[model samples]
Target: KDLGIDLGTANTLVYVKGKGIVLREPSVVAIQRDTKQIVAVGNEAKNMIGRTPGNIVALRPMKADYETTATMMKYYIRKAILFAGKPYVMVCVPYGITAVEERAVIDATRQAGARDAYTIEEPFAAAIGANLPVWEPTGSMVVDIGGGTTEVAVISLGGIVTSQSIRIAGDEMDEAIIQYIRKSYNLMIGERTAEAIKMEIGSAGNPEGIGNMEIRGRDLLTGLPKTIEISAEEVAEALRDTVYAIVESVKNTLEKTPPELAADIMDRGIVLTGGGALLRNLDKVISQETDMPVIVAENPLDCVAIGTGKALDHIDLFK
Candidate 1:
């Protein structure tokens, strides 16, 4: 038996050898500030956010330091697997990550009671999930937008031929929405609200029939709760810079790719995966900008986890 873990910044999704996807949860942890004790984790911790006392704080696992990343990784992995035989775990990693980062992942899995830990590039995992021909000669392009990072890669011959790693992704998009609402409407919004707004009304292009949503937030000037109607078009306008950043990086990846592989990409189109890939009209936006076909991966959010499972299926070849 083997396990595949997405290990995403915003969310963690796991796939067991026999089961498809067994666990998906927010990567949030609540802790006591003074005692440094964990009070809650995942959904419970996420619910405690902004409602906790000053002595308690809820934080996503990534920014808390390397040790916390490993600890939480262990918590997620160990909790998900009660099965015997200690399956080999494949964790998806952003390409070009540092040595220390890789070490934390390995250490975390080792702590999780795994037989061995292996890493696969996130885009490669996404490619496998999208049913791209990874082991063949032709190139397959993939753009994976996770909570904390976005990775764009051109893969060929079972490897990444050209790639770009970005820290600006879904989480950053939510922050950008928060900032835009704060500045434009003099309203202070929370992360969850901002994310809801993004999910409901956000788009990268094609906003001719943009809908509106009523949002409630603190009126910065009046210091009172206020509700205002915001249009989907406004959300798109606010996200322009962020979306453009993604598009530009995709272009950069394309430019750096070999001509032969580039031709394959143009013919086959780029595959988009991850949570951010759910944004409305993002495929159209990328297609318009790049003048190439773009396809949003089926089950965008599950791609990494499923692909990691596929990697485990071929662990012998990897070895």
Candidate 2:
């Protein structure tokens, strides 16, 4: 069997040829410290986060730099393969990654029970998944914002003409929220709580009115459990810098695009995909900054995985 995998920092998605996405799991693993044995992987492991026993810990398998965690990448890949029944795999990577990172991904997959392994850049895969006409002479732009990275690329003639990959993205936003709550309210929050705040009321652009959510955390001064209402506008302020960094990368990529391709991009507009695309009013904010139409893909979170699967169906086109 052959399969496609989107080995994302926050989530891992597997697509079997002719089967679409067969598995979607958080890119987390729980390990027993004393025994050096695996306790859980994926969703089960994610649930263990912040609730682990003293001798056990949950770890993410990949970080922003595409660096594997203390736990071996082969372990995560092997777990994925087992869940996917050991298929020949094609993995998607962020654009502009080093050859070293590519080799690491290939090596990990090969050791994980893959009969063969192939690599595809995230933006290219996303373009295909978003149904962009990349094979044509005309140009199409795609911005893929995943958990750890944001990929901006202009595709034409079945290849990326210009591209930029930035390490600042969703994870940064979550971190910013955590820092903001700690500094502003003197409340220490966990990663999960921070992410919940972002999802509930976070916005890239200026939201119309204040949106509030009750956040439960440890009070710094009193050392007691407490809950406070946080507003959406504050979350937007906290995330401003990180969001601007992503927008700047997109603008820089567009500036470097060829004149003809740039015109085509202007006409067709930019397509946003990946999990980060779900950020409220992100498209509007990017469009306002870049002066280009920005549209979010129908199923933003699943685009890369879907694109990876679609690419498997047209393997020759990639070569």
Candidate 3:
């Protein structure tokens, strides 16, 4: 069997040929400080982040060293399937990653017991997963906002004509919310709490539809636990910069695209994919900014993984 892995900065999703997505987990790994041994992977490791003692560290391996990355991928591969033979695996990556970084991912996947390993750009897979007519001569735009990066691309004739990969994404939004709370209310919060707040009330543009969330954190001045009810409007303000960064990237991609493709995109509209696309009203915000319609891909979170799976049958195309 073949496999596709969305080796994302925030989460890792596994797809098996003919079976769809088989596993989805945080791209976290917990390791001992002294012995340097892995203690946990995936959800359990994510649970330990920002809550561990000096002897343990929990971090995302998608941005870690090569050895740790290989070990983490090995753990996920083994956990995703009971294999009778080594699988040929394709891993998704942001387009702007260095050749060195790209090599590391391919090597890591192979070291994880793959018969062979291949790399596919996230935006390419995203467009396919969004059901865009990529093979046609007309252009289709896709914005894939995952945890660590935002990928904006214009695709035509099965290739990316214009694209931009930015470092700011969902993680940046979470950090922005954390900073906003710390600055405004003098409350210190963990990543988990900040992420929860983003999911509950985070928005772009107007911020009127979603309501509010009760956020708990440590009062900076008092050094004590505190809780505050924050409205979606506040969350939207906190996310303004990060959201606009993504929108700006989309506009840049559009600007760089050929006029013919741009006209095609004008008719087809922009499609948003990945976890960040789920942020409330992000579609409306981008639509307003670009003065073009924007549509969030169905099951935005799974677009990359599903597209990767679909690519398994046409692996040569990605090359």
By lDDT, who's the top model here?
3
**Model 2 Cα lDDT, one tens digit per residue, 50-165:** 67566777777666322333133354455444364666677887787788877777776676667667789999999988999988999899999888889999999989999999
The best-first sequence of candidates by TM-score reads 3, 1, 2
**TM per prediction:** 0.90, 0.86, 0.91
Q: Enumerate residue pairs that collide in model 1.
A: none
lDDT of 2 at 42: 79
Candidate closer to the true structure by TM-score (higher is better), 1 or 3:
3
lDDT by residue for model 3 (282-305), tens? 999999989999999988988999
In the range 1-319, model 1's lDDT, one tens digit per residue, is: 6888886777888888888788888878888899987776676677777575678877776523656666666666666775677778888877877778777777777776777888888899999998889889998999998777889999998888999998878988899899999999899999989999999888887766869999999999999999999998889988989999999999999999999999999999999999888889999999999999999998898888889888887887555
For candidate 1, what's the RMSD?
A: 2.6
For every model in order, what is the number of clashing pairs? 0, 0, 0
Model 3 bad stretches (over 4 Å): 43-56, 82-84
Deviation from native of the Cα of residue 194 in model 1, angstroms: 1.8
Give the 10-residue window scoring lowest on summed lDDT in candidate 1. Answer: 61-70
**What Cα-based lDDT does every candidate model obtain?**
0.85, 0.82, 0.88
